[PDB]
Design a binder for this molecule. Structure first.
Ligand SMILES: [Zn+2]
Ligand SMILES: [Zn+2]
Lengths: 501, 134, 83, 134, 501, 83
C-alpha cells in the first residue's frame, strides 16, 4: 500500500538515514500502522481541524497503512473527511479503524486512547505549537493556523524519528514542545501574541509555488480574516514525484499548473489571488511597475533568490530547506541589516590568474609553476599533464595532445571548453520540513503586514531531524566586502526613491 | 535571453555612467581603431578596424549588453557590423567580468559577485582587452 | 584568563571552555562533538558572533577580545531548496 | 579656413535639426554602410564601408562642416578615418549644395543663394549621393 | 606736376570718358589751372573751413596745377594751410597765387573773384549743400560737416565735368544745388533739420577702411559733439595708388595700416576709437559677443557685405560706388523692409542640370542634345565639341581628346577643372564719389543713432557724372523668393533674441 | 486707355506714354533714350514700382494694373565697390 510516489520519499530518506537500504526502508514502512486519534474537543474547533488536516497530509505521503481513530461519536464525521483526504493522496493507502496493530500514534484533543505504542499528543493555542509525550495538550479556539499546523509538523517529525531511530544520530523524541510561532521562543503566559486575524496583505507576491509554498498556501487558506491582493508566480506544473512534499497536491493535481493550484486553494478566502504561470523575470517584465510591497520567496536556487532582491522590493521573507535545517530570513534593503543577497554572497576572494588556473586544474600546490608557464607561454611538460590528469581523476590519453602546447591552450580546452568534465546530489526534503518552512513563511508575511515588531535576528531556523532547538534565532550581519548590492549607492537610491526614507 | 529584472533605475544609471566615462577617451580609442557606433540602454555597439593594417578593414563588431547590469555582468556578442546579427564561429571572451564566462559551469568557481565593484566588467575593461589581443 | 563559550550549534546550545592561546577551530571541533554534528565537513559551519559576523577559525581565541562569558553561533549557510 | 561669422544661434540650431532628422534613419544608413561616428557643432564625421563587398573595408571617411551654415553651404572633406586628417589625391564632390563647388569660380554662375531653402545642401542630400555613386 | 599716383586716376577716368586716350588725358590736365578762392566769410566758420579742406583734398588728387586764391587778408592764413595740405598729397603739385591763368574756379564765402573762367560758388548751411554757377552761397555756422563736405564734392564733380565735357554725355554743369543731407530732398524753409550735434554713437562698427570709409572718417572728425565708441575694422595698409581716392591719405600714410590711419584721424574727437587690423571674421571671432548696435559697411564685394548681415547686427548702413552711381542703403532685419542680403541676392532661378551644363558650355540652344548625352552617358560627337569650342572662343586642339568621351568627363575637366578658362574690369571710382558716399554713410550712422526718422526708401543714390537727380530716393522691396536670410525663422529668432520685438 | 508713366532713371525723372498692349520693355527703351542712358546693356537696369518690387519687362503694361498716372523706377543694381 506504498504510494506511487514512494521512490521520491526513499530518496528523501536516503539523505538523512545512516546505512540506507531501499528494500529495507520499504519493508520497515510496511510493518508500520501510524494512528491519528482525535475526540470531540479536537474536531469542535478550527485549530483542531487544521492540526488533523495537516497531520494526515503529511503522514499519507509516507506510510502505507494509517489508523484513523475517532475516540467518540462527535469525531465520526471528521474521521470520514480524513479517510477521504488520505485516499485522495494515495488511493492504495491502507486505512484501519482499530488501534490494535498501531505502531505509533498522534493524538489531538483531550482524550487518551489507551494504545500500547508510542503516543504523541499534539495541539496548539493560537500562535503556540504544542507537543507532549505524556499528556493531552488540546486545541485552542483561534482562527490562526500557525500553532496548529506547526504541531502537525512536529508530530509528523516525531513519528519519523521514532520509526527510524536506529538510522539517526542524536534524534531523540521530543518530550515537550510549546513554541510560540509569533516570537519563536518558548511560549510564556505574560506575552500572548495577538489573536486578532484581521490582517491586510496589501499587494504581496509569492514567488515559486513548490513544496515550501504549499505550506504557506495551507496556512493562508486557513486564516479567515486575511484580506488583500496576492500574486502567485510559477511557470511549472505538479509532477507525480512532487506529491512526496506538496501538501496540497493529491493524485488529481498531477499535471496541473502550480499557479492554478495555488489559486484554487485560496478560492474561498477573501484574498484577490492573481495567477501568473510565468517565471519571475516574465512577471516583472509584464508588470513594469517595480514597486513590490511584500515578496515571499520560496524558489530553488541562490541565483533566482538574488534576482528577486535586485528588483528592490520593500521587504522580503525568504524560506528554505536543507539536510539538517530549515528556516526563513527577513529583509528590508535600507535597514542596516542583511539583505537577501547577503545570505547567498560567495565566500573567498578573487584570486590571481595563476592561483585560479592552478586550482581549477587540481594542482593548487603548483601555483608557482603555473605562473611561469603563463609568463613564458611555454609548452606544458609531460609530468605537468600527468599531475593534472591524476589530480582530476581522468585518463591521460585524452589529455595527451596538450603536452608541449601552451598552458593557456590546455586550460582553455580542458576547463573553459568543458573537456575534463566529460571525462569525469539534488536535496529532496522531508514533507514535514517543506510544510513547516511554508507555514513559517506565511507567518512572516502576515506578521510583517500586520505591522507586528519583527524578529531580532535576520533568520529563524529549525532542525526537525533532532529535538527542537532551544535557541531558534540565527543572526546574520550585513555583508561587509562592499561587493553586495546593499552597499551600492545606486541600489540604495532606487529603493529610497520607491519607498521613502 | 536575459530579461531586465533589476530595478531599471539602477541598471540605467550605471549604463549612462559607463558611457560618460567613455566620452573623454573617444578620440584615444579612434586612434586604436575603436568607434562607438550606437549607445542606447542597454546596448553599446562598437566596430573595430586595425589602424596599422592597410587596407583598413572592419575586423570585429560587437554589442555589449548591460541588462541587469552590475548585479549581473555585461554580455559581449560579436555581431555583423551592418545587420547587427550574431556571427557564428581567449577567443569568444572567456574572461571574468563578461556574462558568457560566468555562465559557463566550468567557471562556476569564479562567481561574478567576487569581482563586482572592482573595475572588471566595466566598458573600458572590455574594450581594452579586445583592442590589446585584437 | 580562560573563556567560557556557549556555542549555539544548529539551534542546540552547548558549552566549551577555551584558553586564549588556542585557535578558534578548537572551540569549533569541541562544540561539534558535544552536539554530535561531525558528519558534515566542518567548513560547512559558519562560526558567527551574536551580531552574526563571520569569525576566522584560524585566528586565536584571545584575538577576538571576548569577555569571560560569550555566546557564539555555529550555523549552516542559508539553504537554497524550496521546490 | 571659414570662421564662424553668422550668429551661432542660427547655425547651431540648424546643425542640431539636421542631426535630429538623421537619427530616425540611422539604422537604414547602417545597412548601406554609413555610420555617424561623431556629431558636435560644426562637424559631423561619418565612415563608409560597402556592405556587399567582402572583406568589409572602410572605403571613405568624411567630415561635413556646417560653419556659417545655411547662409553658406556645408563643406565635405575626405579625412583619414582614425587620424581625422585630410587625405590628398563627380569626384571631390563638385555638386551644388557643397561649399567646394560654390567656391569654384567655374561654378560662379550657380550661386548658393539660388539653392538655399530647397533641400540641397542638407545632411541627407550629401550622404545619399556619397552612398549612391560610392 | 602730375601726382605720382596719376595712373590710378587715369584708370578711373578711362571708365567714364568716351574715347579715352592716356597721353591726351595727361596733356589735358597739364593745360588746367584749377582755382580755389575764398574770403573772410568762408574762413571764419567751421563749415567754410571744412568745404575748403575737402575741396583741396579732392582737387589735389587729379590736377597738376592749383591756384589757391585768398580774396582778402583774413584768408591769408587759411591759404597757407591749404597750400600745405595739397603739397602733402602731391609734393610736385604746382601752386599759383594768381587767377590770371585759371581755367576753372571754385569759390567759398561771400566775395566774387573777377575771373574770366567758369566759376562755381559752393557753400552750405547745416545739412544743406549749396552750389551756384551765378552767385555766392556762403557757409553757415553749424558744427555739422555734411552740407559743407557734400558741396566740396559737387564742386569737384563740376570742375571735372567742365574740363572733360567733350568726352561725357549728358553731363551738364549744375546751375544750382541746394540739397538737404538730412532729407535728401531740395532744402525747404519749413523743414530745417536739427543742428544740435550732440549724438551718441553707442558702440558702432565701421567695417572696411578704404575710399568710402575715408569720407566717413573725414565727416566724423569734423562733428564735434559726437561721443561714443567706434570700432574701425580693416587688415590692410594704404598703397600709393590708393591716394587717388583716399581723402585722408597723403604721401606720408603710404604703407600705414588703414586701421591705424582711421584712429589717428579721430584722435582729437571725443570718440573712443578701437583699431582692429583684422578682417571682419577675425573681429567677430575675437569679440564673441555677436551684439552689434550699429554697423556701417564700406567693404568691396557682395560676399563680404552679405557676411556682415549674417552676424545679425541691429541695423546696418551700407555704402557703395559704381560707374554711374553711388548710394547708401539702410537695413534693420526685422522691419518689414529689405535687409542687406536682399540688395545682393542673385537673380534667376536654379536651372536643371541639362540647362546649366548647356549654358556653361556656351550652347544654351543645345539643351535637348545635352540632356540626352547625360542620360545615355554617350560619347560627345565631334561637331558638339567644335560648337562648344567656337562658342567659348577657344582653340579646338586642346579640347580634341574629349571627342567620344562622356559629356560629364568633358564638362568636368573643361568647366569644373578650369581648362577653358586657361585657354581664354576692376571699377576704380572718382575721388569725389568715394568722398560723398563716405560722407553720406557718416550722416546715416549719426542720424540713426540720434534717433531721427529714417529715409522712406531703402536707398539714397547720387550720380556725380551728371547734374544732380531730382528724386534721389531709390526703393527696394524685401526679397520675395523665400531664399533670403530675412525670410528664415531661425535668423529672425536670433535677432529678436538679441534686440527685442 | 493709355497710361502716362514717369520713370525715375538713375535719379533723373522722365515721362513716357504707354499703350496697355505694349510689353514693358518698350517703356524701358523709351525712358533710357529720353535720359540718354543707352551705353550700359539695358538688362543692367531694374524696372521697379514705387514699393521697389521688380517688374517683368516682358509682361504687358496693362497686366500690371497701373492707374492712369504711375511713377516707376529704373535703377541700377546696388554696387559692391568701397575700397
Ligand atoms: Zn546585502
Ligand atoms: Zn533679405
Amino acid at each position: 500500500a506504498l504510494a506511487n510516489f514512494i521512490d521520491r520519499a526513499a530518496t528523501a530518506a536516503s539523505q538523512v538515514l545512516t546505512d540506507f537500504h531501499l528494500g529495507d526502508f520499504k519493508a520497515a514502512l510496511e510493518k508500520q500502522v501510524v494512528a491519528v486519534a482525535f475526540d470531540d474537543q479536537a474536531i469542535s474547533c478550527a485549530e483542531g481541524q487544521a492540526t488533523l488536516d495537516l497531520a494526515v497530509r503529511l503522514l499519507a505521503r509516507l506510510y502505507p497503512v494509517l489508523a484513523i481513530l475517532p475516540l467518540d461519536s462527535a469525531a465520526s464525521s471528521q474521521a470520514q473527511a480524513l479517510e477521504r483526504l488520505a485516499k485522495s493522496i494515495n488511493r492504495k493507502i491502507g486505512i484501519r479503524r482499530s488501534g490494535k496493530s498501531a505502531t505509533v500514534c498522534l493524538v489531538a484533543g483531550a482524550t487518551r486512547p489507551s494504545l500500547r505504542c508510542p503516543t504523541f499528543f499534539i495541539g496548539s493555542d493560537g500562535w503556540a505549537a504544542k507537543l507532549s509525550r505524556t499528556d493531552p495538550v488540546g486545541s485552542g479556539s483561534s482562527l490562526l493556523p500557525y500553532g496548529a499546523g506547526a504541531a502537525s509538523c512536529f508530530g509528523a517529525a516525531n513519528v519519523f524519528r521514532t520509526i527510524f531511530a536506529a538510522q539517526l544520530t542524536g534524534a531523540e523524541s521530543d518530550e515537550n514542545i510549546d513554541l510560540s510561532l509569533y516570537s519563536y521562543n518558548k511560549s510564556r503566559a505574560g506575552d500572548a501574541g495577538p489573536i486578532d486575524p484581521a490582517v491586510d496583505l496589501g499587494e504581496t507576491h509569492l514567488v515559486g509555488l513548490g513544496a515550501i509554498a504549499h505550506g504557506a498556501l495551507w496556512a493562508l487558506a486557513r486564516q479567515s480574516g486575511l484580506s488583500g491582493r496576492l500574486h502567485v508566480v510559477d511557470h511549472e506544473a505538479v509532477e507525480l514525484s512532487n506529491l512526496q512534499r506538496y501538501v496540497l497536491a493529491g493524485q488529481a493535481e498531477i499535471g496541473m499548473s502550480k499557479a492554478v493550484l495555488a489559486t484554487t486553494a485560496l478560492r474561498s478566502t477573501a484574498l484577490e489571488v492573481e495567477a501568473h504561470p510565468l517565471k519571475w523575470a516574465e512577471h516583472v517584465a509584464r508588470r513594469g511597475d517595480w514597486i513590490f510591497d511584500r515578496v515571499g520567496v520560496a524558489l530553488d536556487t541562490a541565483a533566482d533568490r538574488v534576482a528577486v532582491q535586485g528588483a528592490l522590493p520593500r521587504w522580503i521573507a525568504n524560506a528554505w530547506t536543507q539536510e539538517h535545517d530549515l528556516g526563513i530570513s527577513r529583509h528590508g534593503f535600507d535597514d542596516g541589516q542583511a539583505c537577501l543577497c547577503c545570505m547567498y554572497m560567495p565566500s573567498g576572494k578573487s584570486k590571481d590568474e595563476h592561483q585560479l588556473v592552478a586550482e581549477e586544474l587540481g594542482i593548487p600546490e603548483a601555483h608557482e609553476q603555473v605562473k611561469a608557464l603563463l609568463q613564458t607561454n611555454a609548452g606544458v611538460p609531460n609530468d605537468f599533464v600527468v599531475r593534472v590528469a591524476t589530480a582530476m581523476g581522468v585518463p591521460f590519453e585524452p589529455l595527451a595532445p596538450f603536452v608541449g602546447q601552451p598552458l593557456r591552450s590546455f586550460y582553455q580546452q580542458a576547463i573553459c571548453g568543458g573537456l575534463v568534465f566529460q571525462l569525469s546530489r539534488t536535496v529532496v526534503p522531508m514533507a514535514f520540513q517543506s510544510a513547516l518552512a511554508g507555514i513559517m513563511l506565511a507567518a512572516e508575511l502576515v506578521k510583517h503586514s500586520a505591522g507586528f515588531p519583527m524578529s531580532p535576528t535576520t533568520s529563524t531556523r529549525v532542525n526537525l531531524l533532532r529535538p527542537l532547538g532551544s535557541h531558534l534565532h540565527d543572526p546574520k550581519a550585513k555583508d561587509s566586502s562592499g561587493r553586495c548590492i546593499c552597499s551600492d549607492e545606486d541600489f540604495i537610491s532606487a529603493y529610497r526613491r520607491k519607498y521613502g526614507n | 535571453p536575459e530579461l531586465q529584472t533589476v530595478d531599471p533605475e539602477v541598471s540605467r544609471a550605471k549604463f549612462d555612467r559607463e558611457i560618460s566615462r567613455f566620452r573623454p577617451y573617444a578620440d584615444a580609442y579612434r586612434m586604436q581603431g575603436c568607434f562607438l557606433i550606437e549607445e542606447s540602454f542597454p546596448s553599446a555597439f562598437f566596430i573595430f578596424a586595425s589602424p596599422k593594417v592597410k587596407p583598413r578593414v572592419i575586423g570585429a563588431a560587437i554589442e555589449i549588453d548591460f541588462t541587469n547590469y552590475d548585479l549581473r555582468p555585461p554580455s559581449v556578442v560579436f555581431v555583423d557590423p551592418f545587420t547587427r546579427q550574431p556571427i557564428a564561429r581567449s577567443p569568444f571572451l572567456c574572461m571574468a567580468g563578461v556574462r558568457e564566462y560566468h555562465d559557463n559551469p566550468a567557471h562556476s568557481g569564479d562567481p561574478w559577485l567576487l569581482h563586482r565593484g572592482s573595475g572588471e566588467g566595466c566598458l573600458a575593461f572590455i574594450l581594452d582587452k579586445i583592442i590589446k589581443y585584437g | 584568563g580562560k573563556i567560557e563559550i556557549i556555542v549555539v550549534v544548529n539551534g542546540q546550545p552547548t558549552q566549551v571552555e577555551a584558553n586564549p592561546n588556542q585557535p578558534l577551530h578548537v572551540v569549533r571541533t569541541k562544540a561539534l562533538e558535544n552536539t554530535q554534528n561531525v558528519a558534515q565537513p566542518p567548513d560547512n559551519w559558519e562560526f558567527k558572533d551574536e551580531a552574526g559576523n563571520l569569525l576566522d577559525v584560524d585566528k586565536k581565541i584571545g584575538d577576538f577580545g571576548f569577555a569571560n562569558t560569550v555566546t557564539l553561533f555555529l550555523s549552516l549557510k542559508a539553504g537554497v531548496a524550496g521546490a
